[PDB]
Each structure stands twice: as C-alpha cells, then as structure tokens.
Amino acid sequence: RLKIVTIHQEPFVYVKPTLSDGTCKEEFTVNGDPVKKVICTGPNDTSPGSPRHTVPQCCYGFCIDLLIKLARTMNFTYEVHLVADGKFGTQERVNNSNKKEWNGMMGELLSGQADMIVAPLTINNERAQYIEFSKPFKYQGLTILVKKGTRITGINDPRLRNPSDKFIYATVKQSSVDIYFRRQVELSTMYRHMEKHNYESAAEAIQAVRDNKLHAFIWDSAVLEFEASQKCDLVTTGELFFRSGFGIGMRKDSPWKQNVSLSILKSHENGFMEDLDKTWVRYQECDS
Ligand SMILES: N[C@H](CNC(=O)C1=[SH]c2c(Br)ccc(F)c2C1)C(=O)O
C-alpha cells in the first residue's frame, strides 16, 4: 500500500476540511459528474503562531484524478498525505553543517515517508540526480503573475534586472524556481532581491499580488494561468526561460517507474489528459 505524498496547489490539488462527520462535501464537475475526493492527512493550520495539527482532509483536482487512474490501471492501493513542511523540495545544508538533505516532497520520498510524489512537481537534473521521474504528465513553463494592467517584457525587464522596493517580486521558498535563480550567475541581482521576499506557499504569494503587497510572482504557468483565468483582477505576463514538465516522482530504480510512464503515455494518446484539462484547467470564466 503506497504512501502517496502531495501538496496543496490548485487546480492540481485542492485541500478542504472534512465535514463534521469525517466525509467530504458532495460536489459535481462542470460536466455534472461527481468530484472524486480522497482523504489526505496533513497540517491544517500553517498560519505562524498558531499550533499545527495533522488531520484528515479532503483532496481532489487534476493530480488526484490522475492518481486514481494510476491506482486503477496498475492495480495498487494507496494512502495520501500532504508534505509535512509544506514544500516542493530543494537540497539544503542541514543543522548548520556541511551535510545536505532534501526538504519537501523530495526529502519525504528519499526518507521513505513517501513512496511516490503525485503533484505538480517540476522535472529537472538537480532532482533527477536523487530520484526518478515519470515522463511528463503535463508540459508547461515559468511565467509571472501580476495585477491586471501590468506587463513585463520578460527576463530583461528593467524592473527585474535593476530592482527597487517600488516593484517587488518573489517566488516560493524551497521550490526549483528559487534554486534556478540562486544558481544562475547572470541572475544574482534578481536572486538577492527575491531572497528577501519569498513566500512559504503559492497561495500566499498569490494573495499578496491581489492585495498589492507583492507586485510580481514568478511561478508555474500551469498554476498561474489557471489562477489568472479564474481571478479577473490577475493576469500572467512573460515566458521566462525554457519549457518544463510535471512528473510523478519515485525513488531511483523503483519497480513502479516503467508502468507509471506507460500509464501517462496512454493518457496523452487517448484524450484523458485533455479531459482532465477540460475539468480542472479551462472550463469557465473568472469568478474569484
Ligand atoms: N512545480 C514547483 C515549482 N516549479 C519550479 O520550481 C520550476 S523552475 C522552472 C524553470 Br527554471 C523553467 C521552467 C519551469 F517550468 C520551471 C518550474 C516545483 O516542482 O518546485
């Protein structure tokens, strides 16, 4: 029985409380079919100062549908939890030593706290040195979320290249975004500005953009284009860098990998991923 680890990230993974009775609210998709919901245990409260608690919650979204398809196809049982530190996963020196460890879903996978990461997880070489990825289940990139009426030319935008406190930008801590900017020597000035303003989660950075507390949020286009398309006040701008995929994550040399990739290939071939897009990504006008 596989331990699935995932992370709150609309529209791939919604996270909601159970009802009083421990069930999940009965909901239907835009097409009228039941919304599939799985119990995921994890931290409910992340707001600093208040106690944390690991409780049963309700999970659904692109990635949860994808999990259910994988489980049925490949005939496995699972249980799902949210990553305890709330993070995607970067490699960082621990305990003020020279020893390095992965945080986030990365670290949980490596430690055996999870067996499979099922999430909008960016594929790259840094992470590929430690784990294995499926073939992409979704192709995407980096863009920028801003308030309507802002446009950014791209990575050479002066507001990015020559920063001031008049235009604040950030991303999420312990994401591959933060590391890419950390490592690229040509992006040092951007990194140094951002390290001061990064957020613990996407949700928080997004709220900051809406509340005019952050001017620009650098993040996954698959997420941000969904967010911008459902919030009339917010738009995307810029296509930074290169294109990138989301993959299932598994430990090196895992017996799962081949059949997971095969299952994702089928879903690219047969219209299932497109059906998921018509359910979770593009289906109505902005109303938030
Ligand atoms: N999905 C989250 C956030 N996503 C990431 O950290 C990235 S970095 C990066 C670059 Br550079 C170029 C093109 C891209 F699409 C992405 C996505 C995660 O896995 O941490």
UniProtKB/Swiss-Prot annotation:
Glycans are attached at N44, N75, N95, N162, N259. Residues 151-288 are extracellular. Disulfide bonds join C24-C58, C40-C59, C232-C286. It comes from the Eukaryota. NMDA is probably regulated by C-terminal phosphorylation of an isoform of GRIN1 by PKC. Its phosphorylated state is influenced by the formation of the NMDAR-PPP2CB complex and the NMDAR channel activity. Glycine binds at P120, T122, R127, S176, D220. It is found in: Cell membrane; Postsynaptic cell membrane; Postsynaptic density membrane; Synaptic cell membrane. A hydrophobic region that gives rise to the prediction of a transmembrane span does not cross the membrane, but is part of a discontinuously helical region that dips into the membrane and is probably part of the pore and of the selectivity filter. It is linked to Neurodevelopmental disorder with or without hyperkinetic movements and seizures, autosomal dominant: An autosomal dominant neurodevelopmental disorder characterized by severe intellectual disability and developmental delay, absent speech, muscular hypotonia, dyskinesia, and hyperkinetic movements. Cortical blindness, cerebral atrophy, and seizures are present in some patients. Neurodevelopmental disorder with or without hyperkinetic movements and seizures, autosomal recessive: An autosomal recessive neurodevelopmental disorder characterized by severe intellectual disability and psychomotor developmental delay, involuntary and stereotypic movements, spasticity, and inability to walk without support. Intractable seizures manifest in some patients. Heterotetramer; the NMDAR subunits are modular and harbor tiered domains that function in concert to regulate opening and closing of the cation-selective ion channel pore. Forms heterotetrameric channels composed of two GluN1/zeta subunits (GRIN1), and two identical GluN2/epsilon subunits (GRIN2A, GRIN2B, GRIN2C or GRIN2D) or GluN3 subunits (GRIN3A or GRIN3B) (in vitro). Can also form heterotetrameric channels that contain at least two GluN1 subunits and at least two different GluN2 subunits (or a combination of one GluN2 and one GluN3 subunits) (in vitro). Component of N-methyl-D-aspartate (NMDA) receptors (NMDARs) that function as heterotetrameric, ligand-gated cation channels with high calcium permeability and voltage-dependent block by Mg(2+). NMDARs participate in synaptic plasticity for learning and memory formation by contributing to the long-term potentiation (LTP). Channel activation requires binding of the neurotransmitter L-glutamate to the GluN2 subunit, glycine or D-serine binding to the GluN1 subunit, plus membrane depolarization to eliminate channel inhibition by Mg(2+). Belongs to the glutamate-gated ion channel (TC 1.A.10.1) family. NR1/GRIN1 subfamily. This is Glutamate receptor ionotropic, NMDA 1. It comes from Homo sapiens (Human). The gene is GRIN1. The chain holds residues 397 to 800 of 938 of the full protein.
